[PDB]
Amino acid sequence: NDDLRIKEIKELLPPVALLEKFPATENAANTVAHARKAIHKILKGNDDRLLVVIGPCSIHDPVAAKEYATRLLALREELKDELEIVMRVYFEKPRTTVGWKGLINDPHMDNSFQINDGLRIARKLLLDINDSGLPAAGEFLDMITPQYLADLMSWGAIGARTTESQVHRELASGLSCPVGFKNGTDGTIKVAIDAINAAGAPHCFLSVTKWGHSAIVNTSGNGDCHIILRGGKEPNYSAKHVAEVKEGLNKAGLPAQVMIDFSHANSSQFKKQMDVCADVCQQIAGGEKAIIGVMVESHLVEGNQSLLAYGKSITDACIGWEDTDALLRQLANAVKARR
Amino acid sequence: DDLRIKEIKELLPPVALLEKFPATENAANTVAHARKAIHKILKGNDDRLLVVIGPCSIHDPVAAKEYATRLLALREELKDELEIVMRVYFEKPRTTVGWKGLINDPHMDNSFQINDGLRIARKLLLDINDSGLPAAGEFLDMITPQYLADLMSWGAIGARTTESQVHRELASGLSCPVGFKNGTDGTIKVAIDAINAAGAPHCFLSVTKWGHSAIVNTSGNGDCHIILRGGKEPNYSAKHVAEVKEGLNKAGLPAQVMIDFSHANSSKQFKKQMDVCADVCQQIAGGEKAIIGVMVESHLVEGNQSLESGEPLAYGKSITDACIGWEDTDALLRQLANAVKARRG
Amino acid sequence: DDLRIKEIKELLPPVALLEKFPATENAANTVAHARKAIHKILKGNDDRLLVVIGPCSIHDPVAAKEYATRLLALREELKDELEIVMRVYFEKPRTTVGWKGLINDPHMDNSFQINDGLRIARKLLLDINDSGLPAAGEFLDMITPQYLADLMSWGAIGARTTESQVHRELASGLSCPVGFKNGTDGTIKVAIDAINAAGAPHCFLSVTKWGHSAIVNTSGNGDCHIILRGGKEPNYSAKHVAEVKEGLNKAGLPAQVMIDFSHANSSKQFKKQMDVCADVCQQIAGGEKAIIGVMVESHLVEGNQSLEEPLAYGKSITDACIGWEDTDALLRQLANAVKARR
Amino acid sequence: DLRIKEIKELLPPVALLEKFPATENAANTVAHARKAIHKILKGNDDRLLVVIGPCSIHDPVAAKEYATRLLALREELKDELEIVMRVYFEKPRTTVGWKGLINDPHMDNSFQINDGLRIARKLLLDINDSGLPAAGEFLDMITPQYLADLMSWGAIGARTTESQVHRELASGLSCPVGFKNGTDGTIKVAIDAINAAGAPHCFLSVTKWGHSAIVNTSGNGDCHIILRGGKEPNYSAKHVAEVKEGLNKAGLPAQVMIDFSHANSSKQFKKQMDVCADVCQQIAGGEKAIIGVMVESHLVEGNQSLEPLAYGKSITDACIGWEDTDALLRQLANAVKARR
Ligand SMILES: NC(=O)N/N=C(\C(=O)O)C(F)(F)F
Ligand SMILES: NC(=O)N/N=C(\C(=O)O)C(F)(F)F
Ligand SMILES: NC(=O)N/N=C(\C(=O)O)C(F)(F)F
Ligand SMILES: NC(=O)N/N=C(\C(=O)O)C(F)(F)F
Ligand SMILES: [Mn+2]
Ligand SMILES: [Mn+2]
Ligand SMILES: [Mn+2]
Ligand SMILES: [Mn+2]
Prior knowledge:
Four copies of one chain form a homotetramer. Chain A has helices at about 15-20, 25-45, 60-80, 115-130, 145-150, 165-170, 190-200, 240-250, 275-285, 320-339; strands spanning about 5-10, 50-55, 85-90, 135-140, 155-160, 180, 205-210, 215-220, 225-230, 260, 290-295. The first copy, chain A, is α/β, with parallel strands linked by helices. In chain A, the strands form two sheets. Chain A has an eight-stranded parallel beta barrel, surrounded by seven helices. In chain A, strand 4, helix 5 and strand 5 (about 155-160) form a beta-alpha-beta unit. The longest helix of chain A is centred in the N-terminal third of the chain and has 18 residues, at about 25-45. The radius of gyration of chain A is 19 Å and the shape is globular. The first copy, chain A, starts with 5 loop residues before the first strand and ends with a helix. At the A-B interface, strand 1, helix 6, helix 7, strand 7 and strand 8 of A face strand 1, helix 2, helix 6, helix 7 and strand 7 of B. One manganese (II) ion (MN) binds near residues 56, 263, 297, 318 and 319 of chain C. Chain A: One of its GO terms (molecular function) is 3-deoxy-7-phosphoheptulonate synthase activity.
């Protein structure tokens, strides 16, 4: 009574294959370690600096990403006294129903699903970027792919559609990096507050080891978890909403910190991310220590592409690079003000 | 990695449980007949009502089997009006933390004796199917289905994972029909998207019956439907059914629904499923053909009790959501059967 | 790669056959007690003879169980003289090619339903042990022992594999005592060489109960010994035992032998096993204390038959065996020869 | 488990194959070599096949020093000798001992077998990428999946010619395989294994993924005998003649590889030159049945026991030095010119 609806089953490389081929260098290992220890500090109250997770919405061209990482690394070491810069290196995309799920799931973007390649491309891109000294951040959607990338990851996000799901709260509970939970698409805070609490508890569940086998896995629990404001049916980045989310966090016994995502439902329109910036910057300038981080969808070329132009996102519309240089400067100064 | 991964333990692969507990001939009949029976209802070629009914969670095989024996007697007595499937749920999703079900923690004490769990779960599923009674479950975990899916005639994606891509993927290659719940706030769109997503073929990483990860390709599942489970308010009434029916048609899908009488549709008041039932029976007996199914939370004894006390538990009583007891369950099933008869006619 | 490999098919992992067919308590006691009794015979502290006796190969579980029932009766009746251990050999090695046993081709038709074979083999092994009769097998390949070795109270390494590093490694990790047969030349050297190696600890690649390759480290097996099985000519005579007693001291291991009444020692004539028995008995009845064991090819029905129709019940389709009547007489002769040595 | 002490984990072949893929180059080294040994084996190349190199490999630097020297001779004697280097990673013992690089890469009994494979696959990949074919003993059942794609010719140990699992292995190997006569210096055991290895088999093995599987093989037609001596050597044109008839009687081509070392050598490494003279006389005398030759050679003559180690010197069987090696191969190349 098995596998009427399973078409084909193809061999998949275990993580140790991707680990052996592409070990972490000394630089990669250290970039990761330090950014993780930093975001801990910024999260336990002991750094006025602002974490800036920024980069494209999805990666499809490893050359464009390599160029972007080049540029962003300049301002990372430039603004290091106010900002903690981390690059958006997003290989998995959650679809409302149907479509391209990203570089790992379909690297050639032709529904060829040469996943084994996608795992090579992604791991090498992630390793090279960490070797620059640029730390990386991704969304953890699949339960199996993290074993190939998690050691190259300084920070992670759970997507708005899976924030309530127990299997992702289990995953978060065992990641060695800090984790952020987006509010519900229904705008509200509670499912992300439950998720933080769930992901801080020890969990025991079924996962796949570095060998590609199934096993029983115990996790310690992840205390480095925080909310990510992303908007609802209307945006929720305003100074009213922050204070709302602070009380809500204090009620639920959790640190009153927040990361505001300039994009998605918070900009309804990529240009609007810039208006969120001033609004949010006014708050950070005007003594608002509750904002511990920010999320921006930025690429080389602004705008959006569909299914082929260079350095332009094929998923969400991003701000181009000129705008990106401006935005990172407003942030480091809002931080300068607060300090 | 493994900074926050405390400990790793060996897990029996699916083929081990399958070899230890193969479907008997009758068990496999039960699974095969129930799936086609449901598929026929979903296609509109049967005026009968699918009824998924039983404990919120299984924590004691002894009372699970006592309950299955009583349900099977009614399933045979009423089979011209109802297609009775017992809730046999081994996975429980929590708002934050708590007991995640019999598989994850069979002895109910954070021993996490998962191999035992799979052994107890599959033997129980086997015993119930061999007896003639089909089983339903929530598909919550990405790895447990390989151990149990061939003894499952129907599954549910829970309200907290309906929007989850991996859950929509899992349903697209499941052998059985699958119901998708509206969102914990009462949102119909997530579930309709879920049905469309699950109807489509997918390609994604999963774990095989050999316990090894692999690239799997699915054909899509056509036997998917919405479940109305309440939001802020209940959404079982005529008014809401009409909205869901219209929104299915507007999305190009058959306008048919299963209504859960429990959870938010009862405001978590177990006796209120008797009132959801009265209203829903009247809709059916009055001519509503879109109600193809209902779900009820039922046990041997009504109410519930809490593991977390530390006392030894009463027999045959839920340790999760409160359920109606057996006497109410028998009456509910007869009303449902009677309403289906009246709809005929 | 794999220009000469045509197909790869899936293989049930050991843990799946251990879960379908777990040892019963009875079966596990059979293996525990038997393993222990043999180890005590092998170090001197028991004068009984160890008798490994049964079919050349199992091709039919039904006749095998009838054989076990009859053999079990005699195990009890002679237990003060004989430690009776049923030959349950699945895997068979061949000089050219041919049916490699029940595990490899249970349906005896070149279908290679190995999963079925392992299911049948473990089921049969489990039943025989569960009834109280301990079993002995040959270990030929490296992957199958995980599926069966927990129901094995004694083992043998093939005459064609006694010089094998891979086979001496395996013997070092086994929980049962293990005999090594002399070379097809009939020379004894490689046997002792193999008893020394198996006694040492080893580290080698092997498969786990999970069907995965892993690195394994073995303690080493000190319950090993030679099996005399002839060469160019039979080598069971008292003069031959003398030469091998002498060589076993020259190497510093206990001067003991198991004598195989079959194969080269009977010139491949199943009836001649009765003549080997008479000669060995007079050695035992002669005070020869260093003969610790015997191996007999025995079945319900003497002789053999070829594969082509239904077959004869209880009659070997590999090597010719003695039938039950001679089996009963030959075991009584061996018992009385034990009584005489005391 | 009573006699099992520990179960460490093990990279699956596909991990080694992925960190250390075959270069375009190394892929051609093996493709041509394999096809060359095949053409020589189908009686179709006046040339001899010398399998020459250390008894065992225990130092990848000393070893690729050796290799780069022997690549030159391969380039020079290219018209008389198909030269193949002896890259042996696994050693069968007569009881206990050091099983070679893979089992114990640091010779300290720590059994870092995961490093052993990494080291070994790196070495082979290099020697092959430079242009030089490789050869080894196939003793273990699990190791072949890490290394075989860089093996041009393989040998089955003399203490394993009679073992079913090794005949089974050879039936699936993609390279040609030689079978040593047994230690009893007798030839039937090898003749059987040649027939066995040519047939399809079906048996349990392990995949590139580290999983137990059921495997069917096609059979191996590129197999031959290796004369290795017994209680006395067997390289004589008399012994050769005896094997030729016995092999014709068996339906196999009368063809022979002569191993100059081990029992043929009286196990005295310097005698390999005596055997080399006498074997050359046969190749000179038009003898077409000697298709290949095996010699144990290293940078420096002799052997040593297990305190650090003399560079260049075998840790197992004593071998001849490099200059004796150079003269031996030109000795061999000349006799092929005479035959031609
Ligand atoms: N971080 C991302 O780009 N993801 N986008 C989202 C997701 O989680 O799907 C969103 F915030 F819109 F919900
Ligand atoms: N059947 C169950 O107990 N599940 N309950 C639910 C779930 O799907 O979690 C609910 F309906 F509340 F959404
Ligand atoms: N014990 C067996 O049945 N097999 N024994 C032999 C074999 O390898 O056939 C032997 F060589 F001893 F005759
Ligand atoms: N071929 C080698 O270098 N090792 N030695 C042998 C082998 O077993 O192959 C030998 F011939 F000595 F037995
Ligand atoms: Mn986006
Ligand atoms: Mn419930
Ligand atoms: Mn026999
Ligand atoms: Mn040597």
